[PDB]
Amino acid sequence: AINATGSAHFGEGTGPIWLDEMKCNGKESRIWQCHSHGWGQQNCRHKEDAGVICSEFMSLRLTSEASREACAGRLEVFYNGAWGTVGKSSMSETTVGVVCRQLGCADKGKINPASLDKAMSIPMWVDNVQCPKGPDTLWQCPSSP
Amino acid sequence: WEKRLASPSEETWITCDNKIRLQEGPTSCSGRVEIWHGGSWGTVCDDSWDLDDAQVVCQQLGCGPALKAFKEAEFGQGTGPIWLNEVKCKGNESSLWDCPARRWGHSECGHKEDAAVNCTD
Numbered sequence: 706a707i708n709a710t711g712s713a714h715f716g717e718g719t720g721p722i723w724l725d726e727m728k729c730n731g732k733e734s735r736i737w738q739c740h741s742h743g744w745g746q747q748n749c750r751h752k753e754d755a756g757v758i759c760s761e762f763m764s765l766r767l768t769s770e771a772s773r774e775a776c777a778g779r780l781e782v783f784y785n786g787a788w789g790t791v792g793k794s795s796m797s798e799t800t801v802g803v804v805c806r807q808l809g810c811a812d813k814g815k816i817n818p819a820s821l822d823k824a825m826s827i828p829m830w831v832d833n834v835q836c837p838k839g840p841d842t843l844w845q846c847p848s849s850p
Numbered sequence: 851w852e853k854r855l856a857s858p859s860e861e862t863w864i865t866c867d868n869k870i871r872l873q874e875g876p877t878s879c880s881g882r883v884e885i886w887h888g889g890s891w892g893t894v895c896d897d898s899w900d901l902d903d904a905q906v907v908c909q910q911l912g913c914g915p916a917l918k919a920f921k922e923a924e925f926g927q928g929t930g931p932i933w934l935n936e937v938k939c940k941g942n943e944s945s946l947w948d949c950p951a952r953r954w955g956h957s958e959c960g961h962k963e964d965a966a967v968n969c970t971d
């Protein structure tokens with residue numbers, strides 16, 4: 706885990722609250738093995754709903770000087786709570802196709818050289834990405850670790 | 851009954867007890883916020899309990915500026931009904947009754963979320 710959010714950060718659920726006041730050592734694999742007050746032993750409301758942000762959760766966005774997210778600029782990946790760029794080398798046309806379709810900009814795109822300046826420096830995350838034909842998102846495209 | 855003018859000394863001027871108080875705190879100027887309405891005392895929930903709201907409560911009682919506004923019933927579990935919710939004071943209001951909130955409405959907030967305010971002397 707990276708974050709452990711609360712107060713319905715991701716939204717308010719509708720089903721009956723099952724567990725409450727959870728303390729856990731972290732060794733057991735299943736959530737049910739942690740100490741709990743019982744089943745239905747809740748005194749909260751739907752405004753209080755737990756949420757997490759795990760390490761493997763990732764997102765993609767094209768940063769630009771004009772706006773934080775846009776349809777042009779430099780694409781960035783977000784791994785284990787940290788941001789970073791993507792290696793340019795070995796980037797096929799279909800690779801840019803998945804990036805643009807995932808962000809909802811256009812069916813196809815093209816690679817252009819860097820702009821006049823960079824807003825900030827971030828450590829490069831991944832390189833040598835080769836998207837096949839058929840995947841809709843970049844997370845299903847094999848690449849280097 | 852008699853109709854007769856008299857000096858201001860014979861005239862009555864009364865001053866009821868204050869509607870807003872802080873209780874259970876270690877000091878006099880700090881504690882859980884307790885308000886009086888409908889003939890009984892009560893608490894105020896911590897939803898959107900900002901430091902600006904705490905400033906109004908300290909000003910109403912007369913204590914100093916509020917350094918910190920807490921939540922989740924730090925000092926103790928409240929006793930009585932819950933009156934206000936989602937109260938948003940801009941800081942310029944003289945009384946908590948001027949600020950808009952869930953005015954004497956049923957509060958979805960439980961009794962574990964009673965607010966608390968710590969002011970300085």
Ligand SMILES: *[C@@H]1O[C@H](CO)[C@@H](O)[C@H](O)[C@H]1NC(C)=O
Binds near residue numbers: 707708710
């Ligand atoms: C997650 O935790 C990190 C590290 O403390 C923090 O920078 C970030 O704002 C947190 N995100 C959320 C949504 O709480």
Ligand SMILES: [Ca+2]
Binds near residue numbers: 727728729
């Ligand atoms: Ca725990």
Ligand SMILES: [Ca+2]
Binds near residue numbers: 749
């Ligand atoms: Ca609880």
Ligand SMILES: [Ca+2]
Binds near residue numbers: 896921963
């Ligand atoms: Ca709350």
Ligand SMILES: [Ca+2]
Binds near residue numbers: 898900903936938
């Ligand atoms: Ca407020």
